[PDB]
Design brief:
This is part of a larger assembly, with three copies of chain A. With 672 residues, chain A is α/β, with parallel strands linked by helices. Chain A has 17 helices and 19 strands. The first copy, chain A, has three domains: 427 residues, Beta Barrel (Catalase HpII,  Chain A, domain 1), CATH 2.40.180.10; 99 residues, Hemocyanin, N-terminal domain (Up-down Bundle); 146 residues, Class I glutamine amidotransferase (GATase) domain (Rossmann fold, 3-Layer(aba) Sandwich). The longest helix of chain A has 18 residues. Chains A and C meet through strand 1, helix 2, strand 5, helix 8 and helix 9 of A and strand 1, helix 1, strand 5, helix 7 and helix 8 of C. Strand 1 of chain A pairs parallel with strand 12 of chain C. The structure holds CIS-heme D hydroxychlorin gamma-spirolactone (HDD) (3 copies) and calcium ion (CA) (3 copies). The site of one calcium ion has 4 residues of chain C, from helix 3. The site of one CIS-heme D hydroxychlorin gamma-spirolactone has 26 residues of chain A, from strand 3, strand 4, strand 5 and helix 9. The PDB classes it as oxidoreductase. The entry lists the keywords oxidoreductase, heme catalase, molecular channels.
């Protein structure tokens, strides 16, 4: 692997320059012990110059992200449906690297911003690198790639003052959304709990676009990729996401890192929906339109293989920061479609790597290299790392005996465009009328959420739109929401004191679809990796005792347990001063600690109780082991997802069921 | 002030960068549901610009915000310096100032605990003069060659890039404990100075000793102190953490709002002035940037007024 | 080959993208057979994007040059003068790479422009890469690095229209020279035959600056680097260099390439003049002044080892174009001096690579990699190839156990600055007055040339100065030349119609030094690789047999023979249409071909003109077969001239002609003032 070969060991040895000369790097060379630094200090300059040049431009979108290595294993020989080599035998294994991201934030912005998320997977196949550069959400904001800068400028900070960071909660974004109705579907996904997933591990992946699978005989079918999480899906609530941004801006990347270090590497079933070419407009919308999903009732999933992430990078810059994905990295057996969003994307990713890398040889970075030989006539360019032995790099040649040979459908396993694809008509800059329904699928989506999820979504909109200064933009927003659902527009307008416009039922209906709701998708299928905070005290040997015994029984099931006390000591992991409810999926107070919950120089006033109340209001399983304490909280002993038991075993057993349920949604007020 | 470079887009038709009127909402396709054409220059010039919008962030002080203002001299300071912007009572010079945290990337929160930069350009009639200063009057280290060691230790661990904008991790404290010069800046950073209420409520320092040089050749040693006229004020930690999440832009918004409401922040720009012969007279070395000269030993002389009163037009360009 | 690890083989296999996907690259994807090209065609865009970005900026100076790999072998254990590890044992071998170049011309400009030349050597030592970035001439134009852009602007093309390419023959250069008299020394070397060397292999190498040798005990001595050519020194004549520039702009790079390919890799003795610290001002001038040589009479050379170039690159762009030399690549045992031209160079070489490479990681290019492990805390930056395991890249640390360790004089074989070096005084932008004599050494140089060499030098000056438009500049030039030698100013003045000014004898003397004269360094020590052209004819079966016999005999002694005729056939290498006297060091006509001396197959008079040019440029020429007077009379070449040969016998002809090839140039054939 080109990664092993380029690993550099510094665990022994003397400091050297980049050209291998042993040196020191701690004192500048000076004329006299109190004199000025000398230009001839090469040691100073080579070190500072490296440091001066360490940064590269951040990605234009998806700048905040993290990745990991893993493996993809095919479940079957899929030759009946695609020629793709990585899919051509049962048990066939391919190395992968995945990077997850938000969209709008710059590289230091918080993981738990409300946003759409990237899910980019590189398969290093035996017939070349194949990238699926996908999302946590199956539909996108716009219908033509040429609009991407427009969308992105509106959602990124206003350019006079560069405010606000990583947020659609400002005028320009809502102006664009309200002026460009195609945005509604993704908008509804982004405003639901999908905008604030619990972790990268608890989100699906989607290729968004229709692609083709192409067989060796040249026949082809239309496909949508769906990466289906084995950890189940989960979100934060918004008041929790906000606090988390401040307390742990690295929440998602730490979650991914830690799960992999503990042998809980995340898994997804890689699936396709697969349909015939003739069904391009059969489902009541156009499969070239990336704002639409094919409901599962219309085309079920076929499982192809298992994606597992199971090793962290060695150097984040060299691997995560430098990985350069491109939908143009395609392999024989896969082909594009005439999705006008997909089509322009092919151009952008090849071009943008010149900006990041500063030079044309970016496919030579080790993370970008393939796992097979490279035979082509590309030459020179800044940062050329190969030494080519073919001095006759042109086709046709006889001087290198005609090598490299052309690869195509009938030679060298060449890529080939699906040979039934055709084009006809005028050369136009016109939008197909088949793309015009912007509102029926956002409605379908909303209809498919539970009542508490619908409320969350309305509340996300009320929160954002209330921060829009322009009263014109606010009214324009309500006009658009109203075409999806009168009821959403009445509820959102209540909060901003404007009147919804009159119901306009053109795009209304009652249809629902499966697999789009987080709460409706059940208890989590595993609670491993989930986090339990046990609030305890040093003033009481019984407290640390009860804590230790819970720890045993909770760590038993693969929960990450943190014991919190006023000060560190054996058995205590975190002080109250640094603890927060955003740090746990469940909070347990050991009754031995009743007294912290009625001042201290060691932590902010009311910190112990605040954690517990926060946890409760945000819907987490909370409880007391050993009561009265539930009074101090004002937390009802008979509420769902509130546990109080004298027995450790009965407590843990009930509490684990709470963890699976994950959120107690009865704690949230619904509109009338 | 930079009027001559401004570009007005409040009217007109869309053009290319070479003035050809064009559209930019739909790609050119072979047929209405067909593939996009390579000959669509409108599409490629637009996406190419977008693909190349970003430039590398600053290696340190990536997160920051800036504004235009005026420096007004209080006196004719020719008897201490030949510097021309300081040479007549009331003399006015345009400035631009950028404030910042040190360790976080672009996007990180304004109210991380950090040292802060306070950089001022004076566009003088004898050339640009820059004081690239700090909210804290002393720096962590005593030799420039050690800078990448400091910054690598305080920036996120390089295997996973965790934690963002925070000294709260092993590498940084390992460095602080092995490099005892760091103690002075460390104490200031751990105080309320690490979490100012606003850019307007902190002071600015040159940190280094410099020289003033007269037209006759004689010099003096000086430290620059910009003394805030808004007063000093800090957050408390627990509030700074919450604020970092509720409003990552808190200091830039504070500054921007103060200027738009007529409340542009002001500093008195001062120096401690001492003789060449005093370089070691105060019980430490004036060349040593981990040290202050206690005001008991050399009082501040006020040279002029710094007022920031104009927000930029384009954050990126400015 | 030392860079085998990075080689890419394309002698078999199917075309792929840079990411391994097999593809085609001959036809674009179109909507229909006569339709427009599709944006989705990634095969097209990856291929054209690469091509669109193949170029990097050429070097700011020395843009035009050529390189080869080789070996350095130490003749001894040099620990008695230096701690340098590549010099620590008899027969110790170190891979090198060397690049030779001109200075002013762009990429593409002609090898045989009149110029100073670069001679840059990398030693990939077991203690780090060490570069000697030197010259063919021992002295530089200017005494302070800060003046480099002024020198280079004045000698480069004028910036309104970019004329003239690779030439000092224009007003701005001579304005600079006349206003900046430190330039005189280097200017006299450039105007001599050293400005137009016969090949890279026939020139010497110089460090220019005084450096220090430092022993492991911290004592030091001052050194000058001299690389003495084992092929001998040889120049072209100006009228020939000019024709060559147009007939073969690749002359020196081809000469080098062919020499290595035929097993005749060029060699140099790498030497030093060594002197004590306390002799910095003992020789009549300042050793910190890069415009001065230590005459050999005062400090003899010590031979340190053998430099041999014996392997051409595989990819010119990857190896020669990308090699990035720096005097900052220094190794323990060597140190800098306070030469102000050297001091500033340290800065420029590190900085200019950011320009060429477009990013900070240029030392990771294969050609620039060291041959030993790298342990340091430099990280990230564009194009980062390494994946560093150490997650605590700062010092001091405990979390990586204090590694990498600091290296210095007493631990880890660290570089260290010579401990005896000091500075004292005010911080100044003043020139030392010890640097003020700009004229005595150019005069010393002029005196050590033979009378014909002196004529060539005067003629190079007349040629260039006559092309200066400005009469003021021309006057100002005679003023400076006049301070060197009244005689030079008189003789140049005559060409341009101006009086020389009155003798000014402050700096005149009659002193001479060894080893700076090309024409006085005796005959070449070897003639292998020298080029013999045999003019012959297809009309006569017997001319091709004389040519074959003559070929066989000459090739036996390692000479490169070209038979020329009207048309190619077995045994004929080149047509008259392509042949020129610049392609040969010697020209023989086989007397079966006397009749050629008009056709549709070559320009009128071409065969005769080859012989006449060869004679007029000082080459050995002759006629073989026994009947000579018809060729010789057509050419106006006297039968008894030195370097003119006629013999019936092949054996006898060659023995005499080979003496002429060693003499190389017959200087009796050029007029004197
Ligand atoms: C025409 C412009 C354009 C359009 C329409 C899109 N993108 Fe994109 N995308 C970019 C232009 C781009 C980019 C500017 O080219 C980026 C920035 C850095 C890079 O490598 O490419 C990028 C990066 C990028 C990344 C980060 C890859 C990584 O982790 O480095 C993901 C996951 C996506 N995009 C996903 C999408 C999805 C699911 C899209 C719509 C379905 C989409 N992009 C449309
Ligand atoms: C030799 C390395 C080094 C050392 C010892 C310092 N700095 Fe620095 N500084 C840089 C290297 C640097 C830099 C890498 O060159 C930066 C990053 C971006 C830039 O323009 O310069 C910079 C940026 C920078 C900025 C941001 C300016 C802006 O807003 O654009 C400020 C305020 C400072 N520095 C202030 C300081 C102070 C008060 C120092 C100690 C007295 C200090 N620096 C020591
Ligand atoms: C202050 C600037 C400066 C000064 C005073 C000099 N040079 Fe230089 N030289 C450069 C700045 C430079 C440079 C701009 O940095 C180059 C261009 C590309 C590079 O690598 O460095 C260079 C290239 C360069 C090369 C080409 C190396 C190669 O083949 O790649 C040689 C042989 C020399 N120089 C030799 C000299 C000699 C013998 C000098 C006087 C004794 C000299 N230089 C003074
Ligand atoms: Ca806005
Ligand atoms: Ca750490
Ligand atoms: Ca000129």
């Amino acid at each position: 692997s080109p990664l092993a070969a380029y690993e550099v060991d510094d665990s022994t040895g003397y400091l050297t320059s980049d050209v291998g000369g042993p040196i020191q790097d701690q004192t500048s060379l000076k004329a006299g012990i109190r004199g000025p630094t000398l230009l001839e200090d090469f040691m100073f300059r080579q070190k500072i110059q490296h440091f001066d040049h360490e940064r590269v431009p951040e990605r234009a979108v998806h700048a905040r992200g993290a990745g990991a290595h893993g493996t993809f294993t095919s479940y079957a020989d899929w030759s009946n449906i695609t020629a793709a080599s990585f899919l051509n035998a049962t048990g066939k294994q391919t190395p992968v690297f995945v990077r997850f991201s938000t969209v709008a934030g710059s590289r230091g912005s918080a993981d738990t911003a409300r946003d759409v998320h990237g899910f980019a997977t590189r398969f290093y196949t035996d017939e070349g690198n194949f990238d699926i550069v996908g999302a946590n959400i199956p539909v996108f904001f716009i219908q033509d790639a040429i609009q991407f800068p427009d969308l992105i400028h509106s959602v990124k900070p206003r350019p006079d003052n560069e405010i606000p960071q990583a947020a659609t909660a400002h005028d320009s974004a809502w102006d664009f959304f309200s002026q460009q109705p195609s945005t509604m579907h993704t908008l509804f996904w982004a405003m639901s709990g999908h905008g604030i997933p619990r972790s990268y591990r608890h989100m699906d992946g989607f290729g968004v676009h229709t692609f083709r699978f192409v067989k060796d005989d040249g026949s082809s079918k239309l496909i949508k990729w769906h990466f289906k999480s084995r950890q189940g899906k989960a979100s934060l609530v918004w008041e929790e996401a906000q606090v988390l941004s401040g307390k742990n801006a690295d929440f998602h990347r730490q979650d991914l890192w830690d799960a992999i270090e503990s042998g809980n590497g995340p898994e997804w079933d890689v699936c396709v929906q697969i349909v015939d070419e003739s069904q391009a407009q059969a489902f009541g919308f156009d499969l070239l339109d990336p704002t639409k999903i094919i409901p599962e009732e219309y085309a079920p999933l076929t499982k192809l293989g298992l994606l597992k992430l199971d090793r962290n990078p060695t150097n984040y810059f060299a691997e995560t920061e430098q990985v350069m994905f491109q939908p143009g990295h395609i392999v024989r057996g896969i082909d594009f479609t005439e999705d006008p969003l997909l089509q322009g994307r092919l151009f952008s990713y090849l071009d943008t790597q010149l900006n990041r890398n500063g030079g044309p040889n970016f496919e030579q970075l080790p993370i970008n290299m393939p796992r097979v030989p490279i035979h082509n006539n590309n030459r020179d360019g800044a940062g050329q790392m190969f030494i080519h032995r073919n001095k006759y790099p042109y086709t046709p040649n006889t001087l290198n005996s005609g090598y490299p040979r052309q690869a195509n459908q009938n030679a060298g396993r060449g890529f080939f465009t699906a040979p039934g694809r055709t084009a006809s008509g005028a050369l136009v800059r016109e939008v197909s009328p088949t793309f015009n329904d912007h509102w029926s699928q956002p409605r379908l989506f909303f209809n498919s959420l539970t009542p508490v999820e619908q409320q969350f979504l309305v509340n996300a909109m009320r929160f954002e739109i209330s921060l829009v200064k322009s009263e014109e933009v606010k009214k324009n927003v309500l006009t658009q929401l109203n075409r999806v659902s009168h009821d959403v527009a009445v509820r959102v307008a209540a909060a901003i004191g404007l009147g919804a416009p009159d119901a306009d039922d053109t795009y209304y209906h009652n249809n629902k679809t499966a697999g789009v709701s987080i709460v409706g998708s059940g208890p989590l299928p595993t609670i491993k990796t989930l986090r339990v905070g046990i609030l305890a005290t040093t003033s009481e040997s019984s407290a640390l005792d009860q804590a230790a015994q819970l720890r045993t029984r909770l760590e038993k099931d693969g929960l990450v347990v943190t014991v919190v006390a006023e000060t560190l000591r054996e058995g205590v992991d975190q002080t109250y001063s640094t603890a927060d409810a955003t740090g746990f999926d469940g909070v347990v107070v050991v009754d031995g600690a009743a007294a912290l919950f009625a001042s201290s120089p060691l932590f902010p006033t009311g910190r112990p109780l605040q954690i517990f109340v926060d946890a409760y209001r945000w819907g987490k399983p909370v409880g007391v082991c050993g009561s009265e304490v539930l009074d101090a909280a004002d937390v009802p002993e008979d509420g769902d997802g509130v546990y109080s038991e004298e027995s450790v075993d009965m407590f843990v057993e009930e509490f684990e069921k709470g963890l699976a349920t994950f959120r107690f949604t009865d704690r949230f007020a619904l509109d009338s």
